[PDB]
From TrEMBL:
<feature type="binding site">
    <location>
        <position position="127"/>
    </location>
    <ligand>
        <name>AMP 1</name>
    </ligand>
</feature>
<dbReference type="InterPro" id="IPR023468">
    <property type="entry name" value="Riboflavin_kinase"/>
</dbReference>
<keyword id="KW-0274">FAD</keyword>
<feature type="binding site">
    <location>
        <position position="221"/>
    </location>
    <ligand>
        <name>ADP 3</name>
    </ligand>
</feature>
<comment type="pathway">
    <text>Cofactor biosynthesis; FMN biosynthesis; FMN from riboflavin (ATP route): step 1/1.</text>
</comment>
<feature type="binding site">
    <location>
        <position position="98"/>
    </location>
    <ligand>
        <name>AMP 1</name>
    </ligand>
</feature>
<comment type="similarity">
    <text>Belongs to the ribF family.</text>
</comment>
<feature type="binding site">
    <location>
        <position position="14"/>
    </location>
    <ligand>
        <name>AMP 1</name>
    </ligand>
</feature>
<feature type="binding site">
    <location>
        <position position="215"/>
    </location>
    <ligand>
        <name>ADP 3</name>
    </ligand>
</feature>
<feature type="binding site">
    <location>
        <position position="218"/>
    </location>
    <ligand>
        <name>ADP 1</name>
    </ligand>
</feature>
<feature type="binding site">
    <location>
        <position position="168"/>
    </location>
    <ligand>
        <name>ADP 3</name>
    </ligand>
</feature>
<feature type="binding site">
    <location>
        <position position="239"/>
    </location>
    <ligand>
        <name>FMN</name>
    </ligand>
</feature>
<feature type="binding site">
    <location>
        <position position="14"/>
    </location>
    <ligand>
        <name>AMP 2</name>
    </ligand>
</feature>
<feature type="binding site">
    <location>
        <position position="99"/>
    </location>
    <ligand>
        <name>AMP 1</name>
    </ligand>
</feature>
<keyword id="KW-0067">ATP-binding</keyword>
<feature type="binding site">
    <location>
        <position position="11"/>
    </location>
    <ligand>
        <name>AMP 2</name>
    </ligand>
</feature>
<feature type="binding site">
    <location>
        <position position="7"/>
    </location>
    <ligand>
        <name>AMP 2</name>
    </ligand>
</feature>
């Protein structure tokens, strides 16, 4: 069995699609394969907010669901249905995909066609959270608007900032088009290479946004190491020498949103 799609974020709606694949595989003692198109159709438009995560990260996640192969956006945006079906979908008896799904030249590919060629298609309905259709765009807007706290209800977890490499550590998020968080300061949960986990204050400021994070109760530097940050809360907005005091306020303020997040956990 196979599931075809973008899966930017691999959010609640994507999961629904992947679990169903696994359920079908189980009752057929069949094998599993996820085909993930590298980039959505508007990725190149100037008005594209950007991907929730890199294709790499996306793959590390789709992985804890089944072997995953990346279908290169260009190597397929010019194929006729026969061409696609005939090249990645052979020997395949079943495919799992979201509501309305397309895949070939001029976007003329779909369930109905797949069915005409002897392929069983499972169209998974969208997951509605609150009163909206979970989607990568919705989470994409929530990220720019800085409304992080409201992300887990759709993504199924905290929006994450991932990348390479006293005061801070600047995070290089790689070279794909990644959505950016509204500028300002955010409380974050830092996953250190150590295995250990600490909290921190992240500054997001200036087309090419920087991500610097000050880590609480932590020594040594992470130059060259990979880092993962769960973004919890939007603290204050961006603002222009009373600096050595404004950050010190932020810190003392970080501690106390931390306490209140922990407290809430004990219930």
């Amino acid at each position: 069995v196979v599931s075809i799609g973008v899966f930017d974020g691999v959010h609640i709606g994507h999961q629904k699609v992947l679990r169903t694949m696994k359920e079908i595989a189980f009752f057929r003692k069949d094998d599993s394969l996820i085909y993930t198109i590298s980039y959505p159709p508007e990725y190149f438009l100037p008005d594209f907010p950007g991907l929730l995560m890199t294709v790499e990260s996306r793959v590390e996640m789709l992985s804890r669901y089944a072997r995953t192969v990346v279908l290169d956006f260009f190597r397929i945006k010019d194929l006729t249905p026969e061409g696609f079906v005939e090249r990645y979908l052979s020997g395949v008896s079943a495919v799992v995909v979201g509501r309305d799904f397309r895949f070939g030249k001029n976007a003329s590919g779909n369930a109905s066609f797949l069915r005409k060629k002897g392929v069983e298609v499972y169209e998974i309905e969208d997951v509605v959270v609150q009163g909206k259709r979970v989607s990568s765009s919705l989470i994409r807007n929530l990220v720019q608007e800085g409304r992080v706290e409201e992300i887990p209800a759709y993504l199924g977890r905290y929006f994450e900032i991932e990348g390479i490499v006293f005061p801070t550590a600047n995070i290089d998020r790689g070279n794909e088009k990644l959505v950016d968080l509204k500028r300002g300061v955010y409380l974050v949960r830092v996953h250190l290479p150590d295995g250990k986990k600490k909290f921190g204050v992240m500054n997001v400021g200036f087309r090419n946004v920087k991500y610097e994070v000050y880590i609480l109760d932590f020594e040594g530097d992470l130059y060259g190491q990979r880092l993962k940050l769960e973004v919890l809360k939007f603290m204050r907005d961006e603002k222009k020498e009373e600096l050595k005091a404004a950050i010190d306020q932020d810190v003392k303020s970080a501690r106390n949103m931390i306490d209140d997040i922990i407290n809430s956990k004990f219930e």
